[PDB]
Design a protein around this ligand. Structure first.
Ligand code: HEM
Length: 148
């Protein structure tokens, strides 16, 4: 797939600094949806503000995990059924911590945001469509983790 190459190429400069980029994604996420901030609790404590999440080793370690899973999707872009069961398993962990299916879109918007900003003029409408398609495939795989 030429479009798989668009994904792989677009991901290259992100993957070399996954924490800085994932930090953009999550900063965006809490700027769009501050109500997601309490879902991330460590020591039991609640982040008061979005910048508090950024000073937390556990939360930064969470970011790198997410960025690893997106990397795994990229690695497997040309089939993706090779990750299906992992992603479904990831989905039921999300159900169990109380995330809604409806939150998926804001995380995807946060990811696309982060890519557009990183790539600038290199984030062609073809690149964007390819990412939306990839993120959608990952979300449908995860959604089964609700039953599906
Ligand atoms: C529906 C929007 C989402 C919300 C609100 C959400 C929220 C969360 C929360 C609250 C956790 C647990 C945090 C913790 O206790 O440390 C988590 C874990 C995780 N998330 Fe998400 N998430 C969403 C979508 C996604 C997507 C699309 C991906 C990747 C494609 C993803 C990747 C991960 C990974 C890899 C973990 C670690 C799971 C584990 O430790 O077993 N999340 N997410």
């Amino acid at each position: 797939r030429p479009e798989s190459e668009l994904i792989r190429q677009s991901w290259r400069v992100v993957s070399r600094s996954p924490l800085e980029h994932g930090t953009v994604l999550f900063a965006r996420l809490f700027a769009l949806e501050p109500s997601l901030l309490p879902l991330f609790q460590y020591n039991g404590r609640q982040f008061s503000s979005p910048e508090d999440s950024l000073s937390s080793p556990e939360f930064l370690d969470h970011i790198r995990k997410v960025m690893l899973v997106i990397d795994a999707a990229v690695t497997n872009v040309e089939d993706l059924s090779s990750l299906e069961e992992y992603l479904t398993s990831l989905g039921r962990k999300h159900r169990a911590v109380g995330v809604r299916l409806s939150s998926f879109s804001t995380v995807g918007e946060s990811l696309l945001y982060m890519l557009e900003k990183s790539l600038g003029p290199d984030f062609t409408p073809a690149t964007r469509t390819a990412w939306s398609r990839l993120y959608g495939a990952v979300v449908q795989a995860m959604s089964r983790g609700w039953d599906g």
